[PDB]
Design a protein around this ligand. Structure first.
Ligand SMILES: [Mn+2]
Ligand SMILES: [Mn+2]
Length: 199
């Protein structure tokens, strides 16, 4: 699955492929870009298939409903929703286009990498564990981005230690997605990523 969108402020590409033998993806995502802001979330439900999806899809729906809240408030709602489910790992990203400011919060092995034209990257270590309904302390990062910055958020089905090289070399999200194709052909796990190129 590929979905491409653009507006004045961002061009995006979402890619998803199910684990081998599965009809429903255990990963979910939500994204909405308008004239003012981006909300982007990617979640990996524990395990795969329908029961993983029960968890990640609940997160998708909460992010859609509560998109206007801050990232820490949204992620805690997601955590609470995991109480009677398998649970999930997740990342939530909000971008204010006018301020060129992003805010990011995550739990578990969903990765975010932001690459700037200054050749400096933000690629925070994943936070351990998963959203299970149990109390969490959350880490939020807030920063300005340079015009032309690019990012990826990806589930652990995508294993790319040299991701920053791909972001730096590629001149568009389409090119970067094509350069990642080699990592999608195994279907060992659900695999989801969102690429963005910011104006
Ligand atoms: Mn999973
Ligand atoms: Mn996974």
């Amino acid at each position: 699955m590929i979905q491409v969108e653009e507006n004045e402020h961002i061009q995006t590409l979402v890619y998803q492929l199910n684990k081998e033998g599965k009809s429903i993806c255990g990963d979910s995502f939500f994204m909405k870009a308008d004239d003012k802001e981006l909300i982007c979330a990617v979640a990996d439900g524990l395990g795969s298939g329908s029961l993983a999806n029960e968890s990640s899809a609940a997160i998708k729906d909460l992010v859609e409903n509560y998109a206007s809240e801050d990232v820490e408030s949204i992620i805690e709602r997601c955590n609470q929703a995991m109480k009677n489910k398998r649970g999930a790992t997740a990342s939530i990203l909000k971008i204010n286009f006018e301020q060129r400011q992003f805010t990011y919060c995550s739990v578990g092995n969903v990765r975010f990498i932001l690459h700037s034209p200054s050749g400096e990257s933000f690629y925070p270590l994943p936070i351990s564990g998963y959203l299970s309904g149990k109390p969490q302390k959350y880490k939020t990062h807030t920063a300005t981005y340079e015009k032309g910055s690019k990012f990826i958020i990806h589930t652990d089905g995508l294993n790319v230690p040299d991701i920053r090289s791909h972001l730096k070399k590629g001149q568009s999200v389409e090119e970067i997605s094509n350069s990642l194709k080699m990592y999608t052909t195994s279907r060992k796990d659900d695999l989801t990523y969102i690429l963005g190129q910011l104006s």
